[PDB]
């Protein structure tokens, strides 16, 4: 009957959730538990480049607080 | 373990994909093709067996020669049969295509498509019932189920 | 470099599949098979002969309408301009000008196909 | 121009973006804005056959700022000498020219 | 000032409308053959086309 | 002309909506009360640093501290 | 990495050289798209995003009509490719070898200036403004609607008039 | 760590499209009182695998009259473009961020047509040529309209990047203000991918198959690899551009779960339409989009040019 | 910047050398004009982006608006050329000899 279409869609629907959920989680794994910063203007790139050189480890996803 | 055993399973794998995706060709000549439509009709759906009709011979595995094959058409049928990429199968359908059928003694009928293309399965009748052709298609599927093409390759 | 990897990953994937398409299966070639298809019968003439179209007038005006959008896609950044009034007039005129050209093409049977 | 209609009517149809220092869309100074601003001020009233020699010191600066022919020839010379010293094993580059330094904020 | 180079030149027509050899229409021919699914069976329309 | 307007409406509606909205977009900006606010909002955005100006003792109307009441204000934007 | 724009420009030249040899228009369009696609890239390499995708969004639409037109008027029983004529292939390899000979020979005679083989990649950006917004390329194009409106009317008129020009020719 | 991310965007898409082939045959069949494939697996779940295997084990040919270079490069572009075109797609975080995201779509989506043109022309066949010379009419009909619609839709979003559309629809679907466009966008998108009723390049009745009558099993699949991943995409874009799902930054997983619900529902709709209407004639497609949609679309372009002006609703940049 | 413009200028020259030395087709010549403008468009684009001249950015757009209109007129002409000779060839445009 018509509900026999669900197997075609059920594991198809899973296959269209992986590309979305995976990217969000992969970003958080690589970027130290924070979202992937997005540079759409030169102002933001200067800020990431700043954080890349602020931190001793040359990575912009480690954030130094008020401890300097 | 023996290397022969792995070969057969691959042989059964390639055969299986060729059994459940048997695409015929929209090549109904006459008066059996009406019952070749009924095979495609709701009652005896061919999409159940992964059997889908495609117009181009380049994308057709089996050719259902359904209907009387005449002299004027004989050169065309062989040409179309040649275009189908191998492996290809032919399923002669009905009396007019198996032998000459009702027009065996006419001056412009080739007495059976077996004279022009090599036939794999013959489906008798006039017209064969939609089940009779479906039994032919299934009996063609069981033919691919026993090919032994990769098994002999190990023996060559 | 992230975007270079993706297309070259796709290119490799597409090449590998098509490469496996041509060397995996068993082939048996002869002249009758590789000839043009043309619905069972041998073609009377090649398919390279001049094949006249009849929508060439719409084909040309498609270019002018394609350049026409190139003058409209800057609108989202043009709205940010301090003026907001010169932009709007020069936006209506461009769209209105396209319409009048389309309207004249309409009445002259430009969009209709040569019989 | 051939017909001073734009000046006659006073309307600047297409004579406000002639050159780099010509009131960019937002207040973003075009590269070498100061240099060509200097050159255009020098050659005013003084016209054509008198600005090709009196304002030559400033045009050359504008020519250098835009094309940057001299900096490339200069920095090409530094690089060539740097490689020649390396081949003779007489120069060892400093830590901050090799990729290891104390980066500033 | 005729010479061997310009022996074959002719004056232009008075209305500037040359009588060009009327080209023969080379209309494409398509074997709308029997195997076509739109033939309702076996039927060959060898039909002249112009596009 | 009532028949022609509605006869076209009955037979070729698409060419009447296009002409109607075409005239509607031309006339709406003149009547709206917020049309003049499109320009001011695009004057508020400070994309470039507001360059300060020296004091000679004759610059009273510009503020001294950023948060002082003698300069331009955006209090109309918060309540638009 | 430094020799990234140079390789694109060289492919642009090779693609254009292939278009200069004038094969059948089908392949000329394919070569032109290769050059146009490369044209977008080198423009992107220079910090400009909007213009790059415009050369690649307008010439793409153009080649459909050229492809449509060439199959209608300019065709032969056997179209000419780059390898159909050995002379064309001869001037194709010669042209490819020609640039290398010109690119190399210019280097030795002139150390730097027009071409800088020894110093490459260093001379590509010229002092971006590190901190700043509204700098993204494409805002300048949007000036066509403000303090550059003369370019807008003249360009708009050509499209306006062109529709009339085309109809009369094809009447 | 990046290479792994491609797999989570490349393999699932291939699996999803393959299982769309079954879902098409099943949904179409049920609208026609047929049971689609239910013999290969428990419910045909193995049917797409069966079709995939045979085509890559069925001889592909090198026809005498064809052109090998274009005959082989055309399918590669179709799959390369159809797969690389999922890349800037936010779900809700795209694999790469593009400042001009949709323009990437237009150029690449318009670049997919050259697959049909070169495929038809390279395969020196009359029917293949007919398919090629219908994609030109297919594209000349919709490209002028599809670009203007997207301009109008985004003009209340401000930028061109896709991921700003999520922020745009934080509180309301962009369908509601622009449901006129969403209808024109739903047809112009149906023109691309050559999905019925605008199924003319791969015409199966007027032409035997259409730009495919010379592609044997191997390269033939490469076109279906692309012809259906492009169906899921323009449904993916439409649900991102018009049916904006919930973002909820702290819950990225909720966007994808809601996204898939609409993308499948829209995808079931292209297959649903194929099961209901007959096919256009490619002149009527040209007239339909140039006598009806182009007038109204241009008129609506003016309407949305003034909408932020007489409402003070100019969207921001950045 | 310096290395790439030598390649762009010679790209124009090769396209210039192509639109002069004709061949046996007239579509090909129009395609050569496309490459010439393609070289010209990118040079203006790079120079504007190189010098950060955002006021000169509108110019490269206008070249495309007019160069592509030359193609539109050029293609329309070629329709009339073929409808009177049916071959598109260039050596059929020798009827003005006298
Ligand atoms: C995830 C879905 C996509 C999957 C795509 C990848 C598919 C991978 C398929 C794996 C199975 C590999 C075996 C395929 C065999 C196809 C070739 C064939 O059967 O022809 C018989 C061939 C040739 O048979 P033959 O040598 O006897 O042919 C004789 C020729 N005449 C008639 C002239 C005498 O057998 C083989 O040798 C194929 C072995 C391939 C082994 C690869 C491992
Ligand atoms: C690309 C831009 C153009 C650059 C100049 C051409 C460089 C190749 C010269 C070699 C000769 C090619 C030729 O003559 O045409 C033959 C071919 C056509 O061959 P064919 O149609 O005559 O048939 C070949 C049949 N066999 C193989 C049996 C001989 O056309 C081409 O080479 C151009 C097609 C585009 C090539 C693009 C390659 C990109 C590869 C990315 C991976
Ligand atoms: C058989 C061979 C066939 C080859 C077929 C090739 C298929 C091409 C696929 C279609 C690509 C067309 C679109 C062009 C790429 C998109 C350009 C773009 O806009 O984004 C480029 C991206 C930077 O973009 P941007 O948003 O401006 O950066 C902001 C940073 N926050 O980042 C970049 O700048 C990099 C873009 C690189 C594009 C790929 C180039 C490959 C060259 C191969 C030759
Ligand atoms: C407040 C002031 C501002 C107000 C501004 C707004 C004004 C009101 C606007 C109302 C109109 C909305 C937009 C209308 C778009 C449709 C245009 C149209 O009329 O359709 C064109 C065509 C007409 O039919 P035709 O036979 O050509 O008529 C003339 C014959 N000589 O008909 C067709 O195209 C039919 C062929 C296409 C069929 C495709 C099948 C579609 C199946 C239904 C799926 C719909 C799904 C929509 C949801 C998608 C979600 C993403
Ligand atoms: C300067 C010396 C020119 C010497 C002419 C030699 C003949 C020639 O190759 O050019 C003629 C050619 C015209 O083409 P065509 O009439 O078809 O020639 C017959 C081909 N079988 O002309 C052409 O096709 C254009 C050739 C363009 C070559 C560009 C490559 C330049 C780099 C070397
Ligand atoms: C990437 C992974 C691999 C991808 C694999 C690709 C798989 C392909 C997918 C195709 C699939 O997705 C479905 C969807 C719907 C589509 C097809 C199926 C069937 C249907 C066909 O169109 C034909 C229906 C007609 C059936 C009757 C045939 C006999 C007619 C014989 C002619 C003569 C008759 C006379 C005589 C009488 C007088 O009157 C006549 O005229 O739509 O394919
Ligand atoms: S065998 Fe019978 S049903 Fe079949 S074509 Fe002949 S007469 Fe008709």
Domain architecture of chain C: domains with CATH? 2-115 (1.20.58.1610)
| Whether the Cβ atoms of residue H308 and residue H315 lie closer than 8 Å to each other | yes
- Cβ-based neighbour number of residue I85 at 10 Å: 17
Ligand 6: centre distance to CA B123 (Å) = 21
Nearest atom in ligand 2 to the alpha carbon of residue C15 is 42
| Whether the Cβ atoms of residue G46 and residue C34 lie closer than 8 Å to each other | no
User: Which of B71, B83, B66, B69 has its CA nearest to residue B122?
Assistant: B66
User: Which of G65, G22, G15, G75 has its CA nearest to residue G40?
Assistant: G15
User: Which of F35, G134, C96, B52 has its CA nearest to residue H54?
Assistant: B52
Interface of D with A (CB under 8 A): 103-105
Expt. technique: cryo-EM
User: Which of F45, F78, C79, G145 has its CA nearest to residue H313?
Assistant: C79
What is I32-56 written as a DSSP string?
HHHHHHHHHHHHHHHHHHHTT-TTS
**Long-range pairs for A40-43: beta carbons < 8 A, 24 or more residues apart:** A40/G136, A40/H97, A40/H99, A40/H159, A40/H161, A40/H318, A41/G132, A41/G133, A41/G135, A41/G136, A41/H318, A42/G128, A42/G129, A42/G130, A42/G131, A42/G132, A42/G133, A42/G135, A42/G136, A43/G131, A43/G132, A43/G133
- Cβ-based neighbour number of residue B96 at 10 Å: 29
Q: Which residue is associated with the tokens 């009131």?
A: D23
Q: Which residue is associated with the tokens 């804005």?
A: D33
Chain-chain contact of E28 with H206 (C-beta, under 8 angstroms)? no
Closest partner residue to A16 among H4, H252, H263, by Cβ?
H263
CATH of the domain at B58: 3.40.50.12280
Handedness of CA C103, C105, C108, C111 (dihedral sign): negative
DSSP secondary structure code for residue B66 in this structure: B
Q: Which residue is associated with the tokens 């003005």?
A: I96
Closest partner residue to E51 among C43, C49, C54, by Cβ?
C54
| Whether the Cβ atoms of residue H86 and residue H105 lie closer than 8 Å to each other | no
| Whether the Cβ atoms of residue I27 and residue I90 lie closer than 8 Å to each other | no
Phi-psi bin for G113: left (phi > 0), alpha (psi -120 to 50), beta? left
With a CB cutoff of 8 Å and minimum separation 6, the contacts of C7 are H80, H84
Which token pair is E15? 């209305």
| Whether the Cβ atoms of residue B41 and residue B5 lie closer than 8 Å to each other | no
**H-helix or E-strand containing I70?**
helix I58-85
| Whether the Cβ atoms of residue I66 and residue G159 lie closer than 8 Å to each other | no
Looking at the DSSP assignment, which residues form a beta bridge with residue B121? B91
CA distance H21 to H282: 26
- Chain G contact present for I33, CB below 8 A: no
CA distance I65 to G154: 10
CA H296 from chain center: how many Å?
23
- Chain G contact present for I3, CB below 8 A: yes
CA distances C102 to F34, G159, H300, H301, Å, are 33, 11, 16, 15
Nearest atom in ligand 3 to the alpha carbon of residue A45 is 31
Determine the length of chain E.
51
CA distance H164 to H156: 11
Contacts of H219 in chain C (CB under 8 A): 18, 21
Helix (H, G, I), strand (E, B) or coil at H190: helix
CA distances D8 to D44, H14, H175, Å, are 20, 68, 52
**G104: exposed, middle or buried (Cβ count in 10 Å: 0-12, 13-18, 19+):** exposed
Which token pair is C75? 């609108």
- Cβ-based neighbour number of residue B115 at 10 Å: 12
- Cβ-based neighbour number of residue H21 at 10 Å: 18
- Chain F contact present for H50, CB below 8 A: no
Cis peptide before B127 (omega within 30 of 0): yes
- Cβ-based neighbour number of residue G34 at 10 Å: 17
Helix (H, G, I), strand (E, B) or coil at A43: helix
- Chain E contact present for I94, CB below 8 A: no
Distance spanning both ends of chain H, measured CA to CA: 28
CA distance H213 to B80: 12
**H-helix or E-strand containing H111?**
helix H101-111
Instruction: Output the 3-class SS for chain D.
Output: CCCCHHHHHCCCCCCCCCCCCCCCCCCCCCCCHHHHHHHHHHCCCCCCCCHHHHCHHHHHHHHHHHHCHHHHHHHHHHHHHHHHHHHCCCCCCCHHHCCCCCCCC
With a CB cutoff of 8 Å and minimum separation 6, the contacts of B119 are B65, B90, B91, B92, B98, B113
Q: How many CA atoms lie within 13 A of H13 on its CB side?
A: 28
- Chain A contact present for H272, CB below 8 A: no
Looking at the DSSP assignment, which residues form a beta bridge with residue D70? none
CA H224 from chain center: how many Å?
12
Ligand 2: centre distance to CA G24 (Å) = 12
Q: What phi, psi does B54 have (nearest 5°)?
A: -135, 140
What is chain C written as a DSSP string?
-HHHHHHHHHHHHHHHHHHHHHHSS-----HHHHS--STTSPPSS-TTS----S-HHHHHHHHHHHHHHHTTTTHHHHTTSS-SSHHHHHHHHHHHHHHHHHHHHHHTTSSSPP-
User: Which of H121, H109, H19 has its CA nearest to residue H71?
Assistant: H121
For the domain spanning I2-98, the CATH number is 1.10.287.3510
- Chain I contact present for C63, CB below 8 A: yes
User: Which of I52, G101, F36 has its CA nearest to residue H310?
Assistant: F36
**H-helix or E-strand containing G113?**
none
- Which amino acid residue places its CA nearest to atom 1 of ligand 3? H73
Q: Which residue is associated with the tokens 């070169």?
A: H118
Determine the length of chain A.
68
CA distance H202 to H127: 10
Angle separating helix axes H47-55 and H217-241, nearest 10 degrees: 140
CA distance G30 to G38: 12
CA distance B103 to F8: 62
Q: What phi, psi does H312 have (nearest 5°)?
A: 60, 25
Angle separating helix axes H2-31 and H47-55, nearest 10 degrees: 110
Q: Which residue in chain D is spatially nearest to F47 when comparing CA positions?
A: D26
CA distance G153 to G144: 9
Q: Which residue is associated with the tokens 């018509």?
A: A2
Query: Cα-Cα-Cα-Cα dihedral of H14, H17, H21, H26, to 10°?
Result: 130
Which residue spans within chain H are E strands per DSSP?
A: none
Chain-chain contact of H148 with C20 (C-beta, under 8 angstroms)? no
**Touch of F by B (3+ CB pairs closer than 8 Å):** no
| Whether the Cβ atoms of residue H245 and residue H255 lie closer than 8 Å to each other | yes
CA distance A62 to G147: 45
CA distance D6 to H132: 51
Q: Which residue is associated with the tokens 């198996």?
A: B98
With a CB cutoff of 8 Å and minimum separation 6, the contacts of C1 are none
CA distance F32 to F26: 11
With a CB cutoff of 8 Å and minimum separation 6, the contacts of H192 are H109, H112, H142, H146, H230, H234
Tell me whether strands B89-93 and B121-123 are parallel, antiparallel or unpaired.
Answer: parallel
| Whether the Cβ atoms of residue B153 and residue B7 lie closer than 8 Å to each other | yes
Q: Convert H116-146 to b/e letters by CB count within 10 Å (16 or more is b).
A: bbbbbbbbbbbbbbbbbbbbbbbbbbbbbbb
CA distance B34 to B133: 12
CA distance F27 to F30: 6
DSSP secondary structure code for residue B2 in this structure: -
Instruction: Output the 3-class SS for F27-74.
Output: HHHHHCCCCCHHHHHHHHCCCCCCCCCCCCCCCCCCCCCCCCCCCCCC
* Binding-site annotation: residue ranges of B for [4Fe-4S] cluster: 31-32, 96, 126
Domains in chain H: boundaries:
2-318
Handedness of CA G121, G123, G124, G130 (dihedral sign): positive
CA distance H212 to C8: 26
Phi-psi bin for D58: left (phi > 0), alpha (psi -120 to 50), beta? alpha
Which token pair is H199? 């199924």
Chain-chain contact of C104 with G164 (C-beta, under 8 angstroms)? yes
| Whether the Cβ atoms of residue C75 and residue H155 lie closer than 8 Å to each other | yes
- Cβ-based neighbour number of residue D45 at 10 Å: 6
With a CB cutoff of 8 Å and minimum separation 6, the contacts of A33 are none
**D52: exposed, middle or buried (Cβ count in 10 Å: 0-12, 13-18, 19+):** exposed
Tell me whether strands E28-32 and B121-123 are parallel, antiparallel or unpaired.
Answer: unpaired
Which token pair is H285? 């497609």
CA distance H69 to B96: 44
CA distance G126 to G134: 18
CA H303 from chain center: how many Å?
27
| Whether the Cβ atoms of residue B92 and residue B98 lie closer than 8 Å to each other | yes
| Whether the Cβ atoms of residue D25 and residue G140 lie closer than 8 Å to each other | yes
Helix (H, G, I), strand (E, B) or coil at B48: helix
With a CB cutoff of 8 Å and minimum separation 6, the contacts of A66 are none
Q: Which residue is associated with the tokens 């470099």?
A: C1
CA distance H210 to G76: 23
Tell me whether strands B89-93 and B62-63 are parallel, antiparallel or unpaired.
Answer: parallel
**Long-range pairs for A48-53: beta carbons < 8 A, 24 or more residues apart:** A49/G130, A50/D105, A53/D103, A53/D104, A53/D105
CA distances D66 to D32, E22, H181, Å, are 6, 61, 47
As for ligand 1, residues whose beta carbon falls within 6 Å of it are B 10, 14, 149-150, 152-153, 156; C 24-26; H 52-53, 56-57
CA distance D47 to D44: 6
Chain-chain contact of E37 with B55 (C-beta, under 8 angstroms)? yes
- Chain H contact present for A57, CB below 8 A: no
**F52: exposed, middle or buried (Cβ count in 10 Å: 0-12, 13-18, 19+):** exposed
Cis peptide before H197 (omega within 30 of 0): yes
| Whether the Cβ atoms of residue H220 and residue C22 lie closer than 8 Å to each other | no
Chain-chain contact of A26 with H4 (C-beta, under 8 angstroms)? yes
With a CB cutoff of 8 Å and minimum separation 6, the contacts of H42 are A7
- Cβ-based neighbour number of residue B132 at 10 Å: 16
CA distance D44 to B89: 90
Query: Cα-Cα-Cα-Cα dihedral of H298, H192, H95, A34, to 10°?
Result: 50
Helix (H, G, I), strand (E, B) or coil at H11: helix
Tell me whether strands E45-49 and B89-93 are parallel, antiparallel or unpaired.
Answer: unpaired
Please report the residues numbered 46 through 105 in chain D whose beta carbons come closer than 8 angstroms to any beta carbon of chain F.
Answer: none
Domains in chain I: boundaries:
2-98
Query: Cα-Cα-Cα-Cα dihedral of G158, G161, G167, G169, to 10°?
Result: -70
| Smallest-distance ligand from the CA of B28 | 6
| Smallest-distance ligand from the CA of B52 | 6
CA distance C75 to H297: 16
CA distance F8 to D78: 79
User: Which of C62, A38, A61, F74 has its CA nearest to residue H159?
Assistant: A38
Contacts of A24 in chain H (CB under 8 A): 92-93, 252-253, 256
User: Which of F33, B59, G32 has its CA nearest to residue H127?
Assistant: B59
Which token pair is H303? 């309407």
């Amino acid at each position: 009957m018509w509900f026999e279409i669900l197997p075609g869609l059920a594991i198809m629907g899973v296959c269209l959730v992986i590309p979305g959920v995976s990217t969000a989680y992969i970003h958080k794994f690589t970027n130290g538990g924070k979202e992937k910063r997005v540079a759409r203007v030169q102002y933001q790139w200067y800020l990431m480049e700043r954080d890349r050189r602020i931190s001793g480890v040359n990575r912009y996803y480690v954030s130094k607080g008020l401890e300097n | 373990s023996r290397a022969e055993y792995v070969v057969t399973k691959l042989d059964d794998l390639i055969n299986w994909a060729r059994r459940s995706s048997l695409w015929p060709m929209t090549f109904g000549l006459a008066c059996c093709a009406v019952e070749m439509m009924h095979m495609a009709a709701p009652r005896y759906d061919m999409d159940r067996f992964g059997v889908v009709f495609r117009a181009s011979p380049r994308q057709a595995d089996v050719m259902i020669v359904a209907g009387t094959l005449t002299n004027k058409m004989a050169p065309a049928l062989r040409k179309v049969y040649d275009q189908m990429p191998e492996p290809r199968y032919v399923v002669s359908m009905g009396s007019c295509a198996n032998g000459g059928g009702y027009y065996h003694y006419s001056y412009s009928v080739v007495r059976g498509c077996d004279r022009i293309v090599p036939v794999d399965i013959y489906v008798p009748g006039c017209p064969p019932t939609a089940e009779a052709l479906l039994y032919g298609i299934l009996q063609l599927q069981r033919k691919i189920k026993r090919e032994q093409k990769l098994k002999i390759w190990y023996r060559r | 470099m992230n975007l270079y990897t993706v297309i070259f990953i796709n290119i490799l994937l597409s090449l590998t599949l098509i490469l496996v398409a041509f060397w995996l299966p068993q082939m048996n070639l002869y002249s009758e098979k590789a000839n043009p298809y043309e619905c069972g019968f041998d073609p009377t003439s090649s398919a390279r002969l001049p094949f006249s179209m009849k929508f060439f007038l719409v084909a040309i005006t498609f270019l002018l309408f394609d350049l026409e959008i190139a003058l409209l896609l800057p609108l989202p950044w043009a709205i940010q301009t301090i003026k907001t009034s010169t932009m709007m007039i020069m936006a209506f005129i461009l769209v209105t000008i396209l319409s009048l050209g389309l309207a004249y093409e309409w009445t002259q049977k430009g969009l209709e196909w040569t019989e | 121009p051939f017909l001073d209609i734009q000046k006659k009517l006073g309307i600047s149809l297409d004579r406000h973006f002639m050159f780099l220092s010509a009131e960019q869309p937002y207040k973003n100074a075009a590269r070498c804005h100061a240099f060509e601003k200097e050159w255009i001020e020098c050659a005013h009233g003084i016209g054509g056959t008198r600005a090709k020699k009196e304002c030559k010191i400033e045009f050359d600066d504008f020519e250098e700022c835009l094309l940057r022919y001299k900096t490339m020839r200069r920095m090409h010379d530094i690089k060539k000498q740097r490689e020649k010293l390396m081949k003779e094993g007489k120069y060892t580059p400093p830590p901050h020219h090799s990729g290891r330094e104390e980066p500033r904020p | 000032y005729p010479s061997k180079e310009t022996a074959h030149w002719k004056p232009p027509p008075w209305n500037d409308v040359d009588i060009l050899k009327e080209k023969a229409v080379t209309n494409m021919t398509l074997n709308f053959g029997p195997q076509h699914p739109a033939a309702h069976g076996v039927l060959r329309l060898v039909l002249e086309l112009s596009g | 002309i009532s028949a022609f307007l509605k006869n076209a409406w009955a037979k070729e509606p698409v060419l009447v909506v296009s002409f109607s909205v075409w005239g509607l977009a031309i006339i709406m900006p003149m009547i709206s009360p917020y049309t003049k606010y499109a320009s001011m909002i695009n004057k508020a955005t400070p994309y470039n640093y507001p360059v300060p100006v020296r004091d000679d003792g004759n610059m009273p109307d510009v503020p001294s501290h950023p948060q002082d009441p003698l300069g331009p204000s955006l209090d109309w934007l918060k309540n638009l | 990495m430094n020799n990234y724009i140079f390789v694109l420009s060289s492919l642009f030249l090779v693609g254009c050289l292939g278009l200069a040899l004038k094969p059948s228009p089908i392949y000329g369009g394919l070569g032109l798209i290769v050059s146009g696609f490369v044209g977008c890239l080198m423009v992107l390499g220079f910090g400009g995003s909007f213009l790059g995708l415009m050369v690649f969004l307008i010439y793409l639409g153009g080649m459909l009509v050229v492809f449509g037109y060439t199959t209608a008027m300019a065709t032969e029983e056997y179209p000419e490719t780059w390898g159909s004529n050995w002379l064309i292939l001869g001037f194709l390899v010669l042209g490819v070898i020609m640039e290398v000979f010109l690119i190399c020979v210019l280097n030795y005679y002139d150390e730097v200036g027009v071409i800088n083989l020894d110093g490459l990649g260093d001379w590509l950006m010229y002092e971006v403004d590190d901190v700043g917004v509204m700098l993204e390329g494409g805002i300048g194009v949007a000036a066509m609607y403000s303090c550059a409106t003369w370019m807008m009317v003249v360009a708009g008129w050509s499209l306006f008039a062109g529709i009339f020009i085309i109809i009369e020719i094809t009447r | 760590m990046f290479f792994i991310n491609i797999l989570t965007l490349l393999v699932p898409i291939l699996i999803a499209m393959a299982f769309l082939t079954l879902v098409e045959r099943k949904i179409l069949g049920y609208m026609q009182l047929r049971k689609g494939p239910n013999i290969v697996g428990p419910y045909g779940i193995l049917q797409p695998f069966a079709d995939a295997m045979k085509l890559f084990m069925k001889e592909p040919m090198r026809p005498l009259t064809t052109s090998m270079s274009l005959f082989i490069i055309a399918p590669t572009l179709s799959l390369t473009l159809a797969l690389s075109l999922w890349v800037p797609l936010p779900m809700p975080h795209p694999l790469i961020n593009l400042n001009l995201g949709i323009l990437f779509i237009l150029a690449t989506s318009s670049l997919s047509v050259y697959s049909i043109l070169w495929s038809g022309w390279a395969s020196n066949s009359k029917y293949s040529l007919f398919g090629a010379l219908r994609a030109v009419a297919q594209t000349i009909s919709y490209e002028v309209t599809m670009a203007i619609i997207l301009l109008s839709v985004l003009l209340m979003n401000g930028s061109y990047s896709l991921q700003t559309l999520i922020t745009t629809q934080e509180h309301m679907w962009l369908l509601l203000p622009a449901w006129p466009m969403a209808m024109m966008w739903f047809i112009s998108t149906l023109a691309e991918t050559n999905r019925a009723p605008f199924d003319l390049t791969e015409g199966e009745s007027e032409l035997v198959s259409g730009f495919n009558v010379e592609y044997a099993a191997g390269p033939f699949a490469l076109f279906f690899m692309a012809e259906y991943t492009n169906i899921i995409l323009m449904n993916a874009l439409t649900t991102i551009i018009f049916l904006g799902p919930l973002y909820y930054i702290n819950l990225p997983e909720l966007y994808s779960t809601n996204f898939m619900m609409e993308a499948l529902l829209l995808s079931s709709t292209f297959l649903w339409i194929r099961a209901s209407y007959p096919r256009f004639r490619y002149d009527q497609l040209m007239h339909l989009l140039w006598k009806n949609f182009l007038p109204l679309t241009l008129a609506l372009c003016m309407w949305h040019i003034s909408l932020p002006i007489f409402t003070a609703g100019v969207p921001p940049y950045m | 910047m310096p290395s790439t413009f030598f390649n762009l200028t010679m790209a124009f020259s090769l396209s210039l050398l192509g639109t002069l030395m004709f061949r046996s087709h007239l579509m090909s010549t129009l395609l050569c004009l496309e490459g010439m403008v393609l070289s010209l468009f990118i040079m203006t684009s790079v120079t504007s982006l190189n010098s950060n001249s955002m006021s000169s950015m509108p110019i490269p757009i206008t070249i495309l608006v007019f160069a592509a209109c030359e193609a539109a007129v050029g293609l329309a002409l070629l329709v009339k050329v073929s409808n009177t000779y049916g071959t598109d060839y260039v050596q059929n445009l020798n009827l003005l000899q006298c």
